[PDB]
């Protein structure tokens, strides 16, 4: 399948930006994407891994 999502664990509380948590995944998490995905009700970081 495509990119395994992980929930961003260097991330906390709501989200509310698709690049800076895409950032932080890179760099922090060492993911490979990132962004804000809107799981309802709520925008939360997601990091993505090469699956």
């Not at 948590?21 to 993911?31: D, G, P, S, T, Y």
């Not at 990132?34 to 309802?40: A, D, L, P």
């Amino acid at each position: 399948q495509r990119l395994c999502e992980k929930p961003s664990g260097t991330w906390s509380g709501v989200c509310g930006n698709n690049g800076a948590c895409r950032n932080q995944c890179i760099r922090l998490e060492k993911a490979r994407h990132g962004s804000c995905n809107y799981v309802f009700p709520a925008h939360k970081c997601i990091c993505y891994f090469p699956c």
